[PDB]
Design a binder for this molecule. Structure first.
Ligand SMILES: O[C@H]1CCN(Cc2nc(-c3ccccc3)no2)C1
Ligand SMILES: [Cl-]
Ligand SMILES: [Mn+2]
Ligand SMILES: [Zn+2]
Ligand SMILES: [Zn+2]
Length: 452
């Protein structure tokens, strides 16, 4: 009745030993956590990164948010941290006519789901969401200004979310085509400010650290249930699913987890408190809201586990005509080209994805040859700005190959959409390709040798 809280997601308390390597730990909890989509990680008690900042010199431009269930919001788009904090505390205090710390979390949750469903309540809140910059930087210690011995202890932590991208067992590190994707984002919350249901770009992992303040409430759905959830959402708000001109236009929404649970979508919840991590797994839908004034930091990442899903994701984007953030094939080939310095498990996993890539590309090239595309020319796709190498039809970022025609200068289609480029006969077309099979086998062999 009213709101039934979803069951709690897994909570992990790793020992210092388990904690030492984030990627090893994440890989260990993976069979459990991927069944629930999100999980919470409580660091060992003394792991205590120093948070220090001036509340007066940190400025940011707030986003404004209406709180209506099923209403469309766009995903991405002046206060000091002190003035925001004052605004946020006053808002929560006045809303409940109570001191902020006496408002039970259970009640804020109940009330959140009441207010978003009631058409007549027009509650609007504000929040901060931005990547780290110089006007507003990471809450974790970074290199620059002299650091205390304690800050230095945490400079090179795996769980320092600035390091998380560029680690060894990570995969998106040596891409350097994507700042919006693997720089940490900073989030300043207030009571009821919320993040709509979504999954990460390219079905990556994400990891969120709440530095300080009141808790952040999460709902998460396991990856296997993603398409159930989308079916439920398509039925109840099809407006979210019309095609969009790019990625700065993705439409998302608030939706009661109980609605999902009624349609047999498994949902889990958690309250993330200061000093705790939440991790989301590939293609795991999640959403939530802040209990009060707080400060969080989050970053996307990709493990070796993720590589096959990343390939499936790009295929799914193609079917949906959704824009890519990067070329998955370009990333794989970039790693293959650096096979001698790769982690050995990484090399073994890249090798497997590359073999699939090569088999699929064989098939596609045979097909376009049989369509009467004969002329071909090598092309260094990675040098083209992304907007200059998207398939006209499905918007995929080309890298391995594409079709062009002298008739439509500058336009490309991927090899799935050879018929969609123009009216000219196939003999007027050129296959543009990054590599021959011969180019690829040194790369493949290098991976095999590195992987032993
Ligand atoms: O049969 C006709 C069309 C295709 N073929 C040449 C060809 N290149 C490839 C290839 C596959 C993966 C990576 C690079 C090249 N496979 O075949 C001539
Ligand atoms: Cl409302
Ligand atoms: Mn997210
Ligand atoms: Zn295409
Ligand atoms: Zn043409």
């Amino acid at each position: 009745s009213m709101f039934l809280p979803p069951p709690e997601c897994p909570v992990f308390e790793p020992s210092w030993e388990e904690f030492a390597d984030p990627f090893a730990f994440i890989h260990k909890i993976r069979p459990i956590a991927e069944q629930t989509g999100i999980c919470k990680v409580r660091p060992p008690p003394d792991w205590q990164p120093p948070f220090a900042c001036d509340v007066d010199k940190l400025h940011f431009t707030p986003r404004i948010q209406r709180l209506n269930e099923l209403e469309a919001q766009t995903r991405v788009k002046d206060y000091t941290l002190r003035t925001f904090g004052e605004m946020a505390d006053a808002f929560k205090s006045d809303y409940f006519n109570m001191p902020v710390h006496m408002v039970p979390t259970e009640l804020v949750e109940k009330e959140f789901w009441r207010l978003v469903s009631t058409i007549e309540e027009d509650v609007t809140v504000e929040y901060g969401a931005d990547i780290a910059s110089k006007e507003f930087g990471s809450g974790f210690p970074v290199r620059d200004i002299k650091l205390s011995p304690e800050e230095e202890e945490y400079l090179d932590s795996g769980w320092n979310l600035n390091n998380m991208p560029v680690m060894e067992q990570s995969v998106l590190a040596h891409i350097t085509a994507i700042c919006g994707m693997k720089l940490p984002w900073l989030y300043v919350g207030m009571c009821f400010s919320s993040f709509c249901w979504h999954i990460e770009d390219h079905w990556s992992y994400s990891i969120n650290y709440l530095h300080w303040g009141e808790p952040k409430t999460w709902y998460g759905v396991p990856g296997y249930a993603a398409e159930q959830l989308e079916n439920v959402m398509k039925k109840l708000a099809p407006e979210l699913f019309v095609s969009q001109p790019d990625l700065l236009h993705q439409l998302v929404t608030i939706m009661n987890p109980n609605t999902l649970m009624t349609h047999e979508v498994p949902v889990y919840r958690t309250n993330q408190c200061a000093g705790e991590f939440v991790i989301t797994f590939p293609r795991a839908y999640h959403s939530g809201f802040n209990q009060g004034f707080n400060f969080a930091e989050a970053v996307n990442f990709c493990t070796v586990d993720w590589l096959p899903l990343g390939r499936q994701c790009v295929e799914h984007y193609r079917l949906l005509h959704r824009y890519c953030v990067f070329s998955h094939d370009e990333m794989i080939c970039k790693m293959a080209s650096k096979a001698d310095v790769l982690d050995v498990v990484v090399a073994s996993t890249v090798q497997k994805d590359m073999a699939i890539m090569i088999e699929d590309e064989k098939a596609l090239r045979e097909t376009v040859r049989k369509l009467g595309v004969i002329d071909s020319e090598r092309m260094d796709f990675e040098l083209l700005p992304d907007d200059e190498r998207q398939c006209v039809k499905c918007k995929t970022t080309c890298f391995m190959s594409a079709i062009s025609c002298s008739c439509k200068p500058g336009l490309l289609v991927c090899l799935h959409h050879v018929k969609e480029l123009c009216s000219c006969p196939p003999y007027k077309y050129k296959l543009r390709y990054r590599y021959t099979l011969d180019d690829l086998y040194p790369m493949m062999n290098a991976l095999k040798l590195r992987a032993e």
